[PDB]
Amino acid sequence: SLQFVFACISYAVGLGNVWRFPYLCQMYGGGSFLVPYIIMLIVEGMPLLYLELAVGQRMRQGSIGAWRTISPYLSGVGVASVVVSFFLSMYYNVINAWAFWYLFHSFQDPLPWSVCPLNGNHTGYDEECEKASSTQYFWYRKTLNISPSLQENGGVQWEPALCLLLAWLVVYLCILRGTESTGKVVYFTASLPYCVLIIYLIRGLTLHGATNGLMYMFTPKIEQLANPKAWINAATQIFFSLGLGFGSLIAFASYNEPSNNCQKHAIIVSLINSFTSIFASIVTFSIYGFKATFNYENCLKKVSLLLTNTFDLEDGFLTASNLEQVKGYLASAYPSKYSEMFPQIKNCSLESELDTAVQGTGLAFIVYTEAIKNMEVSQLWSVLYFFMLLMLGIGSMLGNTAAILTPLTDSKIISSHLPKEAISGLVCLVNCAIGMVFTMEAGNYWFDIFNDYAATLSLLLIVLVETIAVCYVYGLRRFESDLKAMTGRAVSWYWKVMWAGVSPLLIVSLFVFYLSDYILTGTLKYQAWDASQGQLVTKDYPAYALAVIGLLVASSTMCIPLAALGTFVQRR
Amino acid sequence: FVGWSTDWSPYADQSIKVRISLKSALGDKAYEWNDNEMYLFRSSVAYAMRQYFLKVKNQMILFGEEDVRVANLKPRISFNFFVTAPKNVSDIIPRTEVEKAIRMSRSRINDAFRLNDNSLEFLGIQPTLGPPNQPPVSIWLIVFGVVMGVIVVGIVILIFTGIRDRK
Ligand SMILES: *[C@@H]1O[C@H](CO)[C@@H](O[C@@H]2O[C@H](CO)[C@@H](O[C@@H]3O[C@H](CO[C@H]4O[C@H](CO[C@H]5O[C@H](CO)[C@@H](O)[C@H](O)[C@@H]5O)[C@@H](O)[C@H](O[C@H]5O[C@H](CO)[C@@H](O)[C@H](O)[C@@H]5O)[C@@H]4O)[C@@H](O)[C@H](O[C@H]4O[C@H](CO)[C@@H](O)[C@H](O)[C@@H]4O)[C@@H]3O)[C@H](O)[C@H]2NC(C)=O)[C@H](O)[C@H]1NC(C)=O
Ligand SMILES: *[C@@H]1O[C@H](CO)[C@@H](O)[C@H](O)[C@H]1NC(C)=O
Ligand SMILES: *[C@@H]1O[C@H](CO)[C@@H](O)[C@H](O)[C@H]1NC(C)=O
Numbered sequence A: 001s002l003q004f005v006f007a008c009i010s011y012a013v014g015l016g017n018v019w020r021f022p023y024l025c026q027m028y029g030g031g032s033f034l035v036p037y038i039i040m041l042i043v044e045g046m047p048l049l050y051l052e053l054a055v056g057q058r059m060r061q062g063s064i065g066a067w068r069t070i071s072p073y074l075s076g077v078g079v080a081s082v083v084v085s086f087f088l089s090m091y092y093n094v095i096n097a098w099a100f101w102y103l104f105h106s107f108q109d110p111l112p113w114s115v116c117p118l119n120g121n122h123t124g125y126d127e128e129c130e131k132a133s134s135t136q137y138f139w140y141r142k143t144l145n146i147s148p149s150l151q152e153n154g155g156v157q158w159e160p161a162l163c164l165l166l167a168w169l170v171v172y173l174c175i176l177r178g179t180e181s182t183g184k185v186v187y188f189t190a191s192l193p194y195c196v197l198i199i200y201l202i203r204g205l206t207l208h209g210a211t212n213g214l215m216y217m218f219t220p221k222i223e224q225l226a227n228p229k230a231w232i233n234a235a236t237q238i239f240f241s242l243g244l245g246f247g248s249l250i251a252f253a254s255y256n257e258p259s260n261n262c263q264k265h266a267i268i269v270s271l272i273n274s275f276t277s278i279f280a281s282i283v284t285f286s287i288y289g290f291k292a293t294f295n296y297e298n299c300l301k302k303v304s305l306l307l308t309n310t311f312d313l314e315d316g317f318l319t320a321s322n323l324e325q326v327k328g329y330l331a332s333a334y335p336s337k338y339s340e341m342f343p344q345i346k347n348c349s350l351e352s353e354l355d356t357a358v359q360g361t362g363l364a365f366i367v368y369t370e371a372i373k374n375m376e377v378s379q380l381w382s383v384l385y386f387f388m389l390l391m392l393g394i395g396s397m398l399g400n401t402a403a404i405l406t407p408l409t410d411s412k413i414i415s416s417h418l419p420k421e422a423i424s425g426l427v428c429l430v431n432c433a434i435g436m437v438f439t440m441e442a443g444n445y446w447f448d449i450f451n452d453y454a455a456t457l458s459l460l461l462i463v464l465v466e467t468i469a470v471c472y473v474y475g476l477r478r479f480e481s482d483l484k485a486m487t488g489r490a491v492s493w494y495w496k497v498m499w500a501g502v503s504p505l506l507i508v509s510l511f512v513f514y515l516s517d518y519i520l521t522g523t524l525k526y527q528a529w530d531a532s533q534g535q536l537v538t539k540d541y542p543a544y545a546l547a548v549i550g551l552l553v554a555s556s557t558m559c560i561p562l563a564a565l566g567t568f569v570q571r572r
Numbered sequence B: 001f002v003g004w005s006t007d008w009s010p011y012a013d014q015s016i017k018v019r020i021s022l023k024s025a026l027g028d029k030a031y032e033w034n035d036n037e038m039y040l041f042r043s044s045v046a047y048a049m050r051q052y053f054l055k056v057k058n059q060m061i062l063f064g065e066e067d068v069r070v071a072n073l074k075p076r077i078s079f080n081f082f083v084t085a086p087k088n089v090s091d092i093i094p095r096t097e098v099e100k101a102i103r104m105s106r107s108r109i110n111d112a113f114r115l116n117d118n119s120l121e122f123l124g125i126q127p128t129l130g131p132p133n134q135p136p137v138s139i140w141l142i143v144f145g146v147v148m149g150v151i152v153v154g155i156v157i158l159i160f161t162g163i164r165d166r167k
């Protein structure tokens, strides 16, 4: 019935493809990032997803159990499937906290991101809130209080820490309470995001200069299409959104009937996830193009006002459509006065704004706050959108935490020493203590680091190990025979070829290209807020941050080889 | 510097410059700035001076449209006006009192021309937007406290039920 479809939609629709995807798409030029994602979907999404589902269905065990039954000296990879997920639990719930914050500032008629604060004379506006948008100032100063550079970090901000604590308490409450009622919850917690996205798409398409963002997002610029970073980010994002590497898919498949269809389920899930991500990108980039058009018009109006004031023209004589002609006429009239203010005139174009209108880890929040502030009843839409986003984040965190706790739940020794219910509380407390780091002044930089690297290489390596083990270690013919015995209609040659020599080769090639690009450039830099310029400036990563990122990647990557060496020693 | 300029004068330090943008505040349906609009503006300035001298200094001074002298009119509608004595042109009202008078009755001048504090710039008299009145503290803290209290109560109830089931 429709219950299965709703469950598939809920498993496919998560906070990931709604939040992370627009930010990556804007970072990597829009279409130049969108084109690989579709390419990386039909090549890496469906085949690997179906492989994981088939493995989970056939083995009838958990991730650790399945990867131990496949091979002893490989079982440690299952442990890695927990560690990466743990790292996700380190920071992912932090997003929920931000949502909580943006919810709590949604019951006021003077919305905090709607009106800029006064400078102090009650005569103008703050320089930071004037150079940047009100939403951007609210995000970077009144919400994160971010420092200009990562080197200087202040104390733990108390309000973000309290928001994170509340988010963790809600997560723990949902863990304790919700165990099997989700079948009813799927009836409501799966269609609300689509309705909210439809409403916001309508609002965006009703805004002036909205088609520019859609054109930018669908423009496949070949200049930036060759960047390997775009391919790497697309691959890791699709793996994260589909849940590959985390092992939750295997656990879910182990709970289904042996005769349950898997190819159809995997294809439907992958297509729904891709379509939802594309729809969210469409809405977000429509609003983003609206922002870029507004900034371009404001810049043109400022330039025209300055020229009119300094040359005493008519009020309506100078317009956007005839700016450069008037500039040439003024230069030909008296070049001395024109040159007296020539450096003051700014060259602003749609392309530059669309490239640098709004960027960073909080692109979705800023964009949707801007969209909300141009509504009729702003508070209602703000509450609805933030409630939807918080619900998606809560569902994703519940899934991740269940996937983490399942190997711990299966631990007989741990269960015999402590109550099962206290394990969830201990895990939540430890995760909150670790994630309180992101609540500092410079915690946003650490959040960006753990969003860019805590799942980029680890997921790719886990997927590569899993597909190699399935294709060559266990034996492709044996796996196909087992699947045919279980359900019939053996895998088509397309899936066999993709599992054998397409996906691993593409993963290896992408990893090699990324490593070569990093070695050649050697200039891994992060965006940092600049209040004086009111923009984002690229700054080189410090040594300690690079070492921390390397350690975070290395632990997950070496979790499997270390256990393999241990198993080899035990055998010998 | 050799030469001289035909735009400076010892009394130019008492001049107040006015800049008006009709087609930006009104867009269409905007009147043209002919001599009648200048007469109306001078009458409004004289009225403001009368109001200031009556409501502050308690002096009844009979200003008129001839006592607000205007020069340097430009197609931008940006000129320099200074207010003199009622019949003693050699006497010029100091700029501080003129600025105070304009501040006192700027709303009336804005209303007379259907402009609002941005298309009628006096270049030296900057308006004040107004303090953003604040609730007692805010609403985020109260809602956060209510939500966390409800969450704690629910978690305690769930823990009690689980303990009872395990007992
Ligand atoms: C229309 O408006 C105009 C103004 O725009 C107005 O004309 C003014 O009228 C007044 C009143 O008559 C004039 O003031 C007179 O000045 C006479 C000249 O002698 C003085 O001149 C200088 C004035 O400076 C004053 O203020 C400064 C600063 O406050 C102060 O330091 C001075 O002491 C003085 O009070 C002044 O520089 C000058 O200085 C002498 O002494 C120094 C040494 O200190 C020396 O170095 C100088 O060389 C010089 O010798 C001198 O003080 C003055 O005679 C006169 O005083 C008599 O009359 C008043 C009444 O009018 C009596 O009260 C007083 O006791 C004296 O008997 C008075 O001070 C002003 O100069 C005019 N300004 C202009 C521009 O014209 C018109 O009247 C208005 N018309 C209408 C119809 O309304
Ligand atoms: C506000 O008042 C102070 C007073 O010293 C002044 O320095 C400052 O320039 C004023 N602000 C603006 C925007 O002019
Ligand atoms: C704008 O373009 C002109 C034309 O060459 C150039 O001289 C100037 O540096 C550019 N930037 C600004 C801010 O004017």
Ligand SMILES: *[C@H]1O[C@H](CO)[C@@H](O)[C@H](O)[C@H]1NC(C)=O
Pocket: A122, B127, B128, B129, B130, B131
């Ligand atoms: C702005 O402030 C000034 C004094 O600071 C006050 O006189 C004026 O009425 C204010 N204008 C408003 C609140 O519109």
